[PDB]
């Protein structure tokens, strides 16, 4: 009786939201950006090849200096690279080799990683002893760790396969806030530039916008037909892009609370693993299962170019803070640094 | 290149040397993935031979490292294991169709297309007793079992009841039928009949892994 009545009210509320989104869907992003000129052909060359990983690379993250990056592989090795010289700055042996994510602290003093061990391990890069040591192990997730991102040296946000995201206090080792509401494994998260909000994509084909301080879900974004694997905030924080296994990328708007554009091609039938934006946000770069990285025009939904330099799945990618280069990691155990030439 | 850059580059080469030394050490062991249902009894298979549970056992001076995670997302991590040890409980007729669908997902997974499955049809003693009692009928769950006959080329074990032999080959055929429906030789299923006291499981994995590695080499020698 009461349960049946309540679940009918949820359907009415869903229709109310759907009508509300349709009310503000006066125009389409495609119509708005029809007049602007295309970005042309985007040609990027492999400037650097980072060799030394002996297994599948699962994650990479640039440091804020746009020169150092950390990559994670399932050989149980965290490696910090000097991208300018390809020198290896550090090689961190992982207690659990089944790592799936890695994060570089914005200060550059810490890196984080974690995988099927359900632990987010914090590593101190600046010690008087001259070696990298574990400073914290963040326990509390009941599923694998899929993504992690620092807010500062003391706060980090992690997404897990136990359908929840958590905000952690690194000094005390306790999760101050738990973000619940996803019905599937959360595969990725992206922080807003002001670090007051973050979006997460799960395997329930939905993206949720979370308030860090308040700790609740502000908006829910649906429209994908399969698991979401990647998510990335727009550089101004008012939009984000997702990548799913249905071979499509979608651009959702926070304030309009709906999808604005879909990035798919008929030839593309493979899943998407990673997404990122260029510094101005005009380009959306996505890594694919078909061994390629497609550069999309975010505004016009045009495939601007292709990065074809890997012999296995493109598992991760990232764009530097200064926008100078993009790194691609792959299951073929190599990392490549790309940028164009005049 | 400055004086500090040379010292930095020399540090990088010392890192690269230890990266290769650890990689070669990791290749000296064969990695196995243990899968199965709750009633499979895969733990008992491991214990007799001996978030992630790991066990190391050695057969003829060869080290095996088997991982029992205790799933379409994290199964991609084990994309480069030597073999998958999929265990089922053949006695429980009710959950056999669940195991067949579970096996079908693993076999047809996009990230396990080159991973051979070492099937372990566990708890054969219970299956033999269940058929002997006759209280439960396999035909109730599988209608096609009533029209199935033991192959003439079959080689039953000595002292084995023909009723049990007909049942065992039917259950094995269902898994083999899934295996032979796709793959085209990229991966091969290696079914086995094991019980709760069998102590030859480790050697069966070792012998099957020799064929899995040999099949890997033959593709290298031929697909050039």
């Amino acid at each position, epitope marked *: 009786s009461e349960l049946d009545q309540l679940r009918q009210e949820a359907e009415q509320l869903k229709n109310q939201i759907r009508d509300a989104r349709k009310a503000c869907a006066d125009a389409t992003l495609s119509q708005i950006t029809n007049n602007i000129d295309p970005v042309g052909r985007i040609q990027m060359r492999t400037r650097r090849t980072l060799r030394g990983h002996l297994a599948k690379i699962y994650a990479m993250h640039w440091g804020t200096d746009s020169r150092l990056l950390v990559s994670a592989s399932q050989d149980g090795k965290l490696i910090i690279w000097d991208s300018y010289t390809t*020198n290896k700055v550090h090689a961190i042996p992982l207690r659990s080799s089944w790592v799936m994510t890695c994060a570089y602290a914005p200060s550059g003093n810490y890196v984080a990683c974690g995988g099927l061990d359900n632990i987010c391990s914090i590593y101190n890069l600046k010690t*008087r*002893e001259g070696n990298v040591r574990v400073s914290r192990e963040l326990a509390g997730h009941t599923g694998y760790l899929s993504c992690c991102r620092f807010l500062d040296d003391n706060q980090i946000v992690t997404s897990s396969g136990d359908t929840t995201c958590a905000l952690w206090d690194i000094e005390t080792g306790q999760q101050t806030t738990t973000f619940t509401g996803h019905t599937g494994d959360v595969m990725s998260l992206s922080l807003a530039p002001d670090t007051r909000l973050f979006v997460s994509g799960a395997c329930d084909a939905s993206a949720k916008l979370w308030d860090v301080r308040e700790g609740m879900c502000r908006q829910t974004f649906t429209g994908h037909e399969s698991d979401i694997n990647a998510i990335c905030f727009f550089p101004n924080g008012n939009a984000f892009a997702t990548g799913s296994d249905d071979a499509t990328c979608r651009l959702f708007d926070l304030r309009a609370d709906q999808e604005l554009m879909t990035y798919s091609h008929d030839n593309i039938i493979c899943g998407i693993t990673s997404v990122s934006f260029s510094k101005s946000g005009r380009l959306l770069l996505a890594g694919y299962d078909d061994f390629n990285c497609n550069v999309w025009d975010a505004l016009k939904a045009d495939r601007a170019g292709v990065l074809a330099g890997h012999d296995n799945r493109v598992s991760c990618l990232g764009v530097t803070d200064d926008g100078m280069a993009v790194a691609t990691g792959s299951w073929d155990s190599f990392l490549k640094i790309w940028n164009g030439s005049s | 290149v*400055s*004086a500090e850059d040379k*010292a930095a580059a020399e*540090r990088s080469k010392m890192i690269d040397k230890n990266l290769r030394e650890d990689g070669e050490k990791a290749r000296r062991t064969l990695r196995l993935l243990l899968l199965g249902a709750d009633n499979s009894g895969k733990s008992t298979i491991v214990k007799q031979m001996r978030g992630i549970f790991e066990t190391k056992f050695q057969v003829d001076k060869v080290n095996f490292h088997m991982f029992d995670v205790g799933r379409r997302k994290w199964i991609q991590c084990f994309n480069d294991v030597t073999a998958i040890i999929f265990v089922v409980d053949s006695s429980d007729y009710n959950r056999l169709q669940e195991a067949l669908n579970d096996f079908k997902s693993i076999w047809n997974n996009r990230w396990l297309r080159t991973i051979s499955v070492i099937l372990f049809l566990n708890k054969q003693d219970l299956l033999a007793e269940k058929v002997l009692a006759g209280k439960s009928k396999i035909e109730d769950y599988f209608p096609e079992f009533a029209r199935y006959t033991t192959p003439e080329d079959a080689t039953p074990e000595p002292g084995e009841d023909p009723r049990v032999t007909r049942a065992k080959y039917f259950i094995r055929k269902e898994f083999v039928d899934i295996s032979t429906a796709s793959g085209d030789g990229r991966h091969i299923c290696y079914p086995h009949f094991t019980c709760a006291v069998d102590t030859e499981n480790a050697r069966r994995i070792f012998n099957d892994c020799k064929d899995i590695i040999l099949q890997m080499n033959l593709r290298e020698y031929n697909l050039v």
Partner: single-chain antibody
Amino acid sequence: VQLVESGGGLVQPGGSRKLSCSASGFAFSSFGMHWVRQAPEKGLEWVAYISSGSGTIYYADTVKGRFTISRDDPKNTLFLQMTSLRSEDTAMYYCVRSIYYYGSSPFDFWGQGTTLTVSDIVMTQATSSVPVTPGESVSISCRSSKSLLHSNGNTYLYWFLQRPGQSPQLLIYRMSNLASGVPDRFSGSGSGTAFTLTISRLEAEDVGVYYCMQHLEYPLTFGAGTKLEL
């Protein structure tokens, strides 16, 4: 972090002596090691360098062929075998650790030193002494015969402070970066061949001799040193 030197003492001219440097509290095998000596009432002089992994070894010209530097990583001991000792070798010998990667701070820790008694880019610090008062800003100037700015953007200039009775301590590495544990009042500014160390709001602890060292190439050379007195 500790670096203890031993084996020094009065030796006859033309003799041989073995200096040891035992390291504790840090990963010794990860750091390159230098020997730096200081003649009595004189400035610092670099002696030798052995890299991490013992693959690269450098000597100063005044000691090349007579000194041998070696390390024992399992025992965390640094060695300096000296032969044909001259009266010019009478100095306090310091054991210095230095690790080299992007953003590292070489020459960050010095040992207490051991005393030995026997019976090229030019770094200039023209101002030998500077009278100072507490709370007042002080500037120290350094000059180099060659430009220390490399094509990679680094300027390999280092600043050290040797308080009376104490071993030198790193203040500024690569001409602008502030060493760990050093107050923010110290600031390093430079360009090309001319460098300035500015000390705002001088305190009693800042009193001492300041040395500027170049790390552009071997042999590493020190300035004469500028002494601060009240």
